DNA sequence: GCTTGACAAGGCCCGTCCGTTATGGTATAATGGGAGCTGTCACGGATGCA
DNA sequence: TGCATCCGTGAGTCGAGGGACCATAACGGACGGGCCTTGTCAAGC
RNA sequence: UCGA
């Protein structure tokens, strides 16, 4: 029958597979352990065979090459059988995590990555069941997925342990001090300053959406009240009127005196130049460009032919 | 899309005001990096088939959210704004930002009746 | 500028990557989004691979790159050899488009679920 | 009491609603069965609050209490009882006025009307064919049972999914073939038993699972059907669902309330089959007997139910991972999912609305609103013509007049005056018993719960009765089965108790309601809830008499309770002594801020040494006079057209209303600033701010904050705040300008709180809330300063004034007293209204009101006239003209009444002194002053902020927004020849970062330039269509060149 | 109209220091998910069902 | 090849308001001394 | 929610 729920489709393919017995988990682990030594030989041989060990078979050292491919196909089918049959354990673990940051679809795919890693590190010589050891790896891959994903401005893994450490100490101080909580008692038992605890509370805030309804209806959003990070045209127009008046008092000076003040601060070129680069294009050495600018800035401070540069002080 | 068309600003309280396009872009790359991870370690084919199905649903929800499958949500239980849902509606880019704009050098006030005046003349405070 | 007519067509995969890959004075192009990270939580600066990256879309501030040492108006039109961010204006970020290379093909939802389903 | 749907609902929640939710949640078990957790709900604490009622409004907090229950944690194997009180959640309490305080703002909970749970049948014609009967068994919470009946005798059961046969559900619940046909006519059931097979008890659960969940399992079919209708905590009929099942289907069993009885499903099929045999009643969806209302006691019961279910998942996830003993029961209960469930209902839900506190009439009306919207009600698009009309069962329960016009026309109703809601959620109306043509007005009423339709004959309160003898009239108009008829007075059963029983408490303040139109009475009831409290109110002369009851029930009137002697009265408190710790203090609030920027001032009324009674006014409110309510003033009116100043609903007032402080209100605004924590450096409030001299640093006390009692004007500085900056990106022009005169720029930036445009007043409260003082602060804030500025606003040109009959208008001219017309005694005329708006809108009651108030002006008697009479034509015309003749019998007043023209006198012109040609109707009108003042409508913008994405100007008065030039405004200029005005309004005024700079530079320089560039909104759409996978570009059609144009670059 | 020794000021550059951060691991046994839709009216295609 | 049923598409314009845990190694900004680079002061050519 |  046709259906639209993709979670119902994946749960039907899980239930169509028969579960393994207690003796079949030991049998499949021996071929996976035989696959561990087969890939370790290839990882040791790829450093001296120009990274192309397609026909270099060190395990055999027409009938031996066909039996090597039969053992390689049967060992990869055993790792194919252990992860595929234990997919009901991933659903029983990820159903307790589908409320914090992620949906139910992304948790089974991240939990299946831990089931693959649990199949390689499963040691059947210890005697424990596969469901005991794989629970530690499915829960690890799910918790690492919320620490790395499900947040726009993401936080590191060690920061999630710092927020959980404050929540255990605040609950600890609530039992000793029943009333009147404060923020200085939490920073004393954590051995941290009072300025680092403000950084934890600011980084733990969830981001808000720009298209959320800020009212009781869908008439307005949050983006209608947020300004842009740009300058108003009132400051960009008067910046152009500043050029018409700053160059007016420069044309009344000497042509040598006007050339010093323009190239120094960055006029008519878009780049700021130092005092030594003006002295290398001229035939006059240092201590002249400084006293020319000391003379140019002295005559502009006097109240004579500079009455328009008076109300420009901001 | 360019990043200024999906702006990320910070409010006065310290929270960030993100857009719904950033949450739909992140669902594509997170399911694309998982598909490249499963195809490298020789994953079981029931996991690679399920990973490619969620990659098909992540792009289709990014283009037109709620067209084929179920509408995905975020933190709030409203519908996420996809690429097609910003041009077709009444609050889209056509009917709210192109055919009609908010103009400068404008204002409004209440009106009172002015007698002892003429036509083509209005009272302005 | 001034144009005369607007034409719309189906974007080929060689056309979408034409908007993504941009010429940079190096061996390879860097205009591809590979990570889902947007910015940092400690400082308000983006990362070197992501949806808000400065090596792909341009510098966040005017005449200032991501790593440092180029924060003047003297350097115009050059790319920093240490970081890779072109020192230009901040208005170029709203004109550059990146691309995401997929590992599996995905059908377009407008051609499949549309009316009258031109894919079928 | 007029507020009983809020007080009795929250009282039921504190003793019956909270106990029932905790008893159904307990007990819980683990996966193995080691320990069990059960609560003791009937012994909770409900401890004292933290802050006061007035303190929580200014501290930005909520008037809430902490909830603690005793919890016994027992263990199955080892005998141990761990008794410990665990914190549950924060519950906001209801105040003495019937409201809640959430985040310092007063809020109400609007009562929502929904459908009652039960079985409802409906005859439906899907096409031009046979008659089909449907059914719908609606529960209080759970899945629905929809039984349908097709042609040729086929009854089906639909449980959203595809339909299925009636024998599939009737056999899967557990039944035999002989237990169905004995209580069913069974000849109609043979047509649906032929083409359905004949399943056994186990041959129906498999086929039910194959169509609902498409391998079948014998254990999967039982767990699917039991979880829908037979499982606890997943299906609830409610206390009212069991009552409607035993009434419609006439069942013998009762008091089940938890599980759906399978015998009730057989009775719903039997009632559906008999509808084809022409017996049985088809229910109505718009009937008030099938529509219930719920309130705070019911809406809070659903929020704790969905809050305790989230707590059940954590309580079962902590008793399984921790396999060790010796754990406290206070750590098993996490209050975080239940605190966020109550805070979402009071602050983030749609049904918790912002309280209107303009006058005491709007506060009383907002607590009695009956709205049909909410999470589980209706939708704005799903509302049709039948749900917005008036049902005949609304007679006396819902007010047919008072409803808001516009979008919510009919969806938001109002409760009537004598209406009352019982414990089941149905509206009741009182009625007097009539025995043998005699109204038995001696005992208590009956309070019929809308059961008088098909059984009783009900007469309204308008028939002429005698003094205990009989009824005077021979033909009594009644209503029987939603139809009006006139029968004998000996055949009636009940009669109404009041003529104002139909209208609400706001419509009853309109005198002569029977003479006004129903469309203008709708507007007169809405304008009365918008009248501002004046400085010195005055009681109306033509009042209806119900203003005294609405003032005491508003909660803003101090009443006596002790029957004692008043000792000390001042402007702050009233001290009396109780008699048959004997000195109580009644506090009096002075100029408190309301929600709608009005005042809540209380004035003392009693004197020292006066006997009081329980129920006596000790101190009246702001919009309340002595005893009764007072929303306006009684001043002279004249219905005469002036020289175009009252042309189209305009008002001409005199200058006497200005200098006598008439219609003068006090508005208190509140400003807000906060010293937040910037990551570059902490912000602090200083006085030495840059680039501001002594012109604005006169009212600061060397702390950056203003003092109390300082007159602030537009453009001042209330709180001087600085903000550190780290830009260091100075342009070469500013580096040269600073190097000349010195004065190097500091690292701070002025972010001081300033007064907006058109705002002034006197500062009255400069309360500062900082840390280490005993109050909680939001994170990212060092000092919170709150400034309250009060101003005294007089009546001006442009303000919107109205009366009690819908005669609204805007003042256009204030004339002096020598230019206004004057009466023949020399008294001038205050208002010169226009008589043209009277006969076109049927506003006849406003002419009866002014002509009766003018009779009460010359006599000084303050008439109280109840609406809806008495003898016809002898109670309205001869009452007014008869009392105007008594005022003319005085020896000093002979010009008041005339024999030729009764309701008219001769009025003289004020400018020329000559009398007018025709006599003019004068009188004492009662006008109100609305909240739509001229100060709140002024907005202008040259160049301000811009949008984030489209780079367009924003919109809003409080953020310097621009007016929107929408699509209907483009079509007017496109129909004109204005092509250059259309290109200017779209390019250089909006969405162009380059064109706005050159257009502003052209006006200052004096040389305008043509040819603006490409707007920004088109380039945003170009990049959005390229991200959709569409290769869209712009080209050039020039000679032998087809190249794409770069609009962005 | 210019020129030279002298005195500090400060930006990069290159080492280490320690907070910050990415990565891998833990062995009783544990094995198919929840949360709403059920009161809108009209028109135009698209299946599908005989 | 015509008749039912289901799904997708529309449904007025402006303004105001309020609103799990731990161990270990790699990575990177901060701090400090050394090295030219750059601005400034008093006479003397 | 409220004004036209
Ligand atoms: Zn750089």
XYZ file of C-alpha atoms (C1' of nucleotides) in Angstrom, chain D residues 107 354 381 595 939 956-958 962-964 966-968, chain F residues 4-6 10-20:
28
model
C -4.319 40.121 31.431
C -4.329 42.143 26.684
C -11.300 31.475 7.183
C -2.581 49.761 30.163
C 3.590 60.900 11.710
C 5.681 52.358 12.103
C 5.153 55.540 14.084
C 7.396 54.446 16.971
C 7.291 55.425 5.849
C 3.831 55.243 4.300
C 3.164 52.258 2.048
C 0.514 49.723 -2.341
C -0.825 48.168 -5.523
C -4.096 50.128 -5.546
C -17.465 9.659 -7.991
C -13.722 11.115 -5.124
C -9.656 13.609 -3.984
C -7.685 31.502 -4.799
C -10.576 34.328 -0.938
C -9.893 43.781 0.065
C -6.603 48.009 1.264
C -3.948 51.368 4.915
C -2.915 52.696 10.240
C -2.313 51.981 15.573
C -1.117 48.524 19.356
C 2.175 44.532 21.639
C 5.638 41.325 21.867
C 26.204 11.703 30.236
